[PDB]
Amino acid sequence: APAAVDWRARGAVTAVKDQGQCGSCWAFSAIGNVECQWFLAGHPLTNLSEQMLVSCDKTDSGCSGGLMNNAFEWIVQENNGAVYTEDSYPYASGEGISPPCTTSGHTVGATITGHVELPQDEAQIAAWLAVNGPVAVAVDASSWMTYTGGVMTSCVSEQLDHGVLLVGYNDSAAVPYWIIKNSWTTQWGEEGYIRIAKGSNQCLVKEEASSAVVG
Ligand SMILES: *[C@@H](N)CNC(=O)[C@H](Cc1ccccc1)NC(=O)c1ccccc1
């Protein structure tokens, strides 16, 4: 694997979004992954719908929580692999209110055929990310409220509570780090992003890493 990767520089990552006052990070993580994978598949970078998952995906629990794996599963097995555009199915749960599911007239932004899980190994995850793009991961963001910038090194790593997106790493730095996309606006952290120490399983980052498959 390369010494450093940043898929943002490859224009493969969309703008930082805002989940608002809603427990829908799982949806943002999954959808982000699908966005990046769709671009890297040879298609235009399209903003996709988190609201599709929050409202329609009943395997998960809307604004109270859910799982990225469950989202990919639901997309393939229930929604024929379709991921709608954010433009034709916009996010509306910003204040905590989830509209009902609508299945007439929406526009398919991406089409996935499956998903893969990555080993609980930062090296193997990086090895994947360097080739096939950004990875949906679960973390312990309990100590993230106070993050303002820099490489976090003593992140509270107890129990998973947040869904974020690995978009790259840097093994060349004095302290090697993961570059992580969050869904807490651009005011938080490093322009919406956060760098965490790589190799010491910070925030339990290596626990649940998955990626969609765009056949
Ligand atoms: C983010 N603000 C919403 N939080 C959750 O959805 C929360 C944490 C989470 C971790 C990994 C992947 C997705 C979400 N959900 C859970 O703790 C959880 C666990 C088991 C079943 C449902 C929800």
Author numbering: 1 to 215
Show me the paper's own sentences about this structure.
Chagas disease is caused by the protozoan parasite Trypanosoma cruzi, which is transmitted by blood-sucking reduviid bugs of the subfamily Triatominae. The cysteine protease cruzain is considered to be an attractive target for therapeutic intervention in the treatment of Chagas disease and the vinyl sulfone K777 (1) has been developed as an irreversible inhibitor of this enzyme. The human enzymes most closely related to cruzain are the cathepsins, in particular cathepsin L, and these have been targeted using the nitrile ‘warhead’ to form a covalent bond with the catalytic cysteine in a reversible manner.
Nitrile-based cysteine protease inhibitors targeted at rhodesain have also been shown to inhibit cruzain and a library of cathepsin inhibitors has been used as a source of antiparasitic leads. The design objectives of this study were to explore and map structure-activity relationships (SARs) for dipeptidyl nitrile inhibitors of cruzain and to evaluate compounds based on this scaffold for their trypanocidal activity. The dipeptidyl nitrile scaffold, as exemplified by 5, was adopted for this study since it is an established starting point for synthesis of Papain-like cysteine protease inhibitors and the P2 and P3 substituents can be varied easily using readily available synthetic building blocks.
